[PDB]
Amino acid sequence: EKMQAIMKTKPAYGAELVEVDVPKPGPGEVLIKVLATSICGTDLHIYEWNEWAQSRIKPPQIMGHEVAGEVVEVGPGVEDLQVGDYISVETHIVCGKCYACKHNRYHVCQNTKIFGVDMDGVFAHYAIVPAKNAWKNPKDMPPEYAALQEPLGNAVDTVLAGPIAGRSTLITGAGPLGLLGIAVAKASGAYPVIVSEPSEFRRKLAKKVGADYVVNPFEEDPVKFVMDITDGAGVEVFLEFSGAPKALEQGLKAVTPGGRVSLLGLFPREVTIDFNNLIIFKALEVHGITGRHLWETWYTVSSLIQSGKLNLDPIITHKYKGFDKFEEAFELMRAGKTGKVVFFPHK
Amino acid sequence: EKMQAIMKTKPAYGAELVEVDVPKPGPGEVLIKVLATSICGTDLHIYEWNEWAQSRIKPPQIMGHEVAGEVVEVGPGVEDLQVGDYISVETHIVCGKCYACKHNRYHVCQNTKIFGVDMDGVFAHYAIVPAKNAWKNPKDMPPEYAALQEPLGNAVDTVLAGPIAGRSTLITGAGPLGLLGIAVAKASGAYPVIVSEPSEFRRKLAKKVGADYVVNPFEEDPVKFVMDITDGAGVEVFLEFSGAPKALEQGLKAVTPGGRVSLLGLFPREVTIDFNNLIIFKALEVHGITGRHLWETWYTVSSLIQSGKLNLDPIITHKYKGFDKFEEAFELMRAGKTGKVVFFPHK
Amino acid sequence: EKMQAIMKTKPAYGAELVEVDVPKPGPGEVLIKVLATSICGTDLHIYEWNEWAQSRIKPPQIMGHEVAGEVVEVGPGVEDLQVGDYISVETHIVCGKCYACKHNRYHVCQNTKIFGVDMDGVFAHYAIVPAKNAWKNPKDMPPEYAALQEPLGNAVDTVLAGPIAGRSTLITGAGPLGLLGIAVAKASGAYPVIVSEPSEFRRKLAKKVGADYVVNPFEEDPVKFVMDITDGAGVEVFLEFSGAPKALEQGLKAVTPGGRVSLLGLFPREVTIDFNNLIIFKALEVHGITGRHLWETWYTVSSLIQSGKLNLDPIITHKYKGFDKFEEAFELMRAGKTGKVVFFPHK
Amino acid sequence: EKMQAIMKTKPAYGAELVEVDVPKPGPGEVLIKVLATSICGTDLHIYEWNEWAQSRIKPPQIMGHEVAGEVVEVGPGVEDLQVGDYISVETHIVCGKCYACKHNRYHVCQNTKIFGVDMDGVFAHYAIVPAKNAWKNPKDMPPEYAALQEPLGNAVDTVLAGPIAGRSTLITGAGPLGLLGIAVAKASGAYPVIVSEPSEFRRKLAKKVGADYVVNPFEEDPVKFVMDITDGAGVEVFLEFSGAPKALEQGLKAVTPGGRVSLLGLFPREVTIDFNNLIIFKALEVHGITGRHLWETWYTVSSLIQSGKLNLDPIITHKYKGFDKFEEAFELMRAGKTGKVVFFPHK
């Protein structure tokens, strides 16, 4: 029982396509056959071998964590999963019975392990998946969609931290999460969705996903752009995808008084904010968004995917049959050339 | 100066197309040219001269309330409106002074009279409109969509009484309003939208509009149909459009525990319910839905219309030029043969 | 080691103070020295050997489940509890592996065993507690307050299904749950709290607790009473503790439009309701209330106990040392002469 | 007809007690006898003639806004008010047909004038008041309380911008708004209320009002102090009253993940915040609080007052008959030596 695996072998940059033994699932574990698997930020940082990577991941370890996989074997004393179950994985392995956790706050909740970071991930033909992190998918759901579901739940928690149907919306940043964010907003009835993005490639993508207006902040004033569209009102809803200090300010200026803000992008530094003018006098409701509601956000994700109202096709810019072009995948990724990237391990 | 009006002349079934003077705008009023005007269930009641109408309306009066109009003249001291403004009207005239209106509850709060019930409506070439009740439309909005924007506030407040993106939803009743409800729900991300409708014409329109599943409750059980779709979980949102006492019971049985019910349809008699099992051990949140949120609800409808996502044309089944066929139009309604029916008075 | 239990020995009405072998904490279980233990309506139904009781309980079974107790021994696989932890039990053994639970609805979830119904209970010097069901108390919290926290959770979920601070409140029914319901209301700033209650013993107790107005719905119309105190506005919040079909109607009439209703009290029969006038046109929000939110509801009850703002002393009308006057307790309860009744087993 | 007024005569520190004519109410206006009026921080900046006041106020003008007053005469066309009516005023003479007010966001409306900022206030024996701005008091509400109802509105909207019963609360700032903040929060069932204040006079007035723990953020770390009381959990509600840049930060570290912050204190300058650690990974909901909800917030303050639960007497520290000592009043206030200060102009 041998398989191919994308492996962090040493401390250096990069990874290796390695042949390894298929793992045996132990108690509370299932082995799945990987049908589709995608690369996020974090896999990219492990690839790059950045400063965070080095203090966290001790090679050799299998990479990846966004899957659509089929259960093939089940470990001792797993009820609830069986062979043939089609699943996706939640990697935030949570508390259970902490303060935040007893209060059902599983997204802002502490501790135990990350899957794909602290143990082997899923860029392999087969992967061990702890049964308590498994999400069952509908059987007719394309594995390539199913595999977006974790980050798509970042975008659902962001888009829908409050109501959006019929709401003028500003999105800053059209990276992978921001593109999924726009997909979620439009399926939720947001109108106009206005996207502020510096990258011309990323705005092509924004416009494709279904954004109603895109503005280039480096090129034209994104606040003035929003006041042109909203005839002076500003946007009801501002969603922060980038982490760029300037785009916080700017969206904070373009939201309407009494409007609502979702903060997902992570900042490089402390930001300097005129609180009085931008939050207290505007009476904003500002939401900090991290992690995923267990399992409310997954129900929503599953079901907007199944509605066909998510325009996901543009976001998946690259699909790769097996793991042979792994290097090229990560490289086009590093170069800002990819929407989402999907490997199909069994072509 | 003269015009035609569809007019309740005597207390009996029917209406007369009559010739009448064009009213002059007093202070705080404006005069509008009626561009499109739509037929309501209250209008059908008045025409038919049922029990409620016989109590409420004193003949003679101009019928109608649902209006897309252009301002031709403006009373003394109207600052906010001018000649040329394309407006729709909120038929509920204000309170500011009542307990319910001081609380911002205009939907529930009562009466300084109603448009087309207590005063002259807008089945007429021109109509008077208090400035306070006027909502300005974007100039590219078809008047036939603008006209529906009142009963679309009703569908908005039913659909968005709570969150709906990604939520399985049961709609009972696909009359005009229920159809409006399916189209909002689909624009707001509901999935599946399951429709329960005994009329086959009405089921075909639900399907055209965008319902994911239609069921006839006279032909099979609408609850087991729900439970087959939601794997025995039930629907998370149940919207009551019919006012059939049996629909209420079946939807309440069909809602998931923790689920959400909005009630719009008005019942014919008091309804006998199993409180304990259908509402209390299910821990349901149940809202009665009446009127419109002045004006939050109108910003949402306006912008759902401009968004392109409301599938309204399959709902608009009958368009008339002028009023000469008004009898054919009410009688087609009565007979359950219409979606929404639009008069264009100036062709 | 020998203990006293209150035991349901046969079929028959009544119970038996027997002598028994202290049990053996097994896997996932702890054993606790019982400090305070209270009787609820289900203990009364097991004792009256009603119809529900015979189909549910196979004797002999130890009775009770409202407990304040100390861990004196810990079984295999326990980890989160240890000797000396002062705890209360949550009897609804839920399961984070259902649709309702995966959605964090532990109050309307499918249940395993109930503790005190399907297995032995707490009317006894020591008791097996499953350790997943245990809630730890601050150690200076009195055992007889702590005994009350399950039913104070019903009352919290009911009082606080919505905001209540500054809010006119109608409570119908001042049995124990409505007494606790009043205590919570007054600690949460509800004002005036009006209580409708036919028993004068119970209305006396409702004033002691802190109700601002009590009315006898038998001597006087409770609706016109509310319209009096609220100058015709109606109450803003109506909480249903009785389960009297007629109180449902009357509180539905006395609540203001836009008002909020919590349904707790269980009904003898289907109730016939005018939905149009009472629910739809008043635009009510109505909450079916059952069970308790794990573990939000416990946090608030604990904290509200610790505040000393719960006027709970008037509710606890009978305290008994050990189990010897046990028959008198049940009879006083059966005859409606108690608020809550608390045993101290080690006294 | 003559009276006295505390009047901003020239652009400099201070004010003159001057004799002026008694105003005549025109249409839409009411003339009141002023029974009690408190001093606001805004009036303090008009008095000092700080920077803000230099920009906005145009002397000569009567200062003051927080009023309890008795109608003595009604202008042409006032129907809801008559002589003898006991009223309080909302000094936000609101925006009109604007976006924020059309959504019902009156608290954050960007108009129209302000009472005793842009037109004569109420530090006089008589004052003209727009009828639409008038709130009716219960005849038995003492005037010193009715007069604190506007800044009690600030405190209510801040305390109760989400749920608070049973919620561990940190209040930073026990100045006049903060003291009302603590009194509202206790009447709401908040527990514990932990107060952070440098002034010792103020920490004692905090404790008198009903704070459960006070800390000096200059003697010991308030974060650490919050961590010991809440067993390391943090506070569940963080309410910012001071506008101290250091307090904003310490609050945000103090709040539990999933916690709620309400920001009301105005900052002296832009603030530098770790967004990633303090709002985003902690998944806070942050509400900027400004103005008052017209008129829910007034219903709420009225009824909490009338309820006896607001511990208002220790807050009112200085009570003055006529305006003769109006410089002692303002000077004690600057010095930080008052809770709230009331003038009784007709002593």
Ligand SMILES: NC(=O)c1ccc[n+]([C@@H]2O[C@@H](COP(=O)([O-])OP(=O)(O)OC[C@@H]3O[C@@H](n4cnc5c(N)ncnc54)[C@H](O)[C@@H]3O)[C@@H](O)[C@H]2O)c1
């Ligand atoms: N909140 C959390 O705990 C959490 C969880 C997951 C991801 N994230 C964050 O969201 C992620 C977004 O992921 P991604 O895949 O979209 O990263 P990304 O680099 O691919 O996208 C974010 C950026 O937005 C654009 N941008 C940069 N400056 C801008 C500006 N000044 N105005 C407008 N747009 C600007 C950039 O071109 C880039 O697209 C990262 O920001 C990460 O910081 C946060």
Ligand SMILES: NC(=O)c1ccc[n+]([C@@H]2O[C@@H](COP(=O)([O-])OP(=O)(O)OC[C@@H]3O[C@@H](n4cnc5c(N)ncnc54)[C@H](O)[C@@H]3O)[C@@H](O)[C@H]2O)c1
């Ligand atoms: N609640 C409010 O304040 C408010 C305001 C306006 C209108 N309404 C109500 O909602 C409105 C809907 O109006 P419309 O224009 O959609 O009405 P409609 O009368 O034309 O049709 C609704 C019905 O649904 C179907 N139906 C009948 N029995 C059914 C059953 N047992 N199960 C499922 N479906 C069934 C019928 O074919 C019919 O179409 C009316 O009921 C109006 O009374 C309520």
Ligand SMILES: NC(=O)c1ccc[n+]([C@@H]2O[C@@H](COP(=O)([O-])OP(=O)(O)OC[C@@H]3O[C@@H](n4cnc5c(N)ncnc54)[C@H](O)[C@@H]3O)[C@@H](O)[C@H]2O)c1
């Ligand atoms: N919702 C759930 O799943 C759930 C959970 C726990 C308890 N409960 C229910 O609520 C419980 C209350 O328990 P208790 O211990 O307070 O019950 P209880 O029988 O001891 O008291 C309720 C009764 O309310 C009063 N009442 C009767 N008719 C009335 C009327 N017409 N108007 C006003 N009051 C009237 C009676 O005097 C009596 O006080 C019971 O009603 C039980 O039915 C429901």
Ligand SMILES: NC(=O)c1ccc[n+]([C@@H]2O[C@@H](COP(=O)([O-])OP(=O)(O)OC[C@@H]3O[C@@H](n4cnc5c(N)ncnc54)[C@H](O)[C@@H]3O)[C@@H](O)[C@H]2O)c1
């Ligand atoms: N948000 C709105 O739109 C709005 C409207 C009006 C007033 N306000 C604000 O709330 C008010 C606060 O209440 P006030 O009227 O009592 O003013 P206040 O100055 O008396 O209280 C603020 C300060 O709190 C204390 N403080 C200072 N530094 C602190 C620190 N580092 N940590 C903890 N506490 C500290 C000081 O003793 C002083 O009381 C003012 O800040 C005003 O700016 C806001």
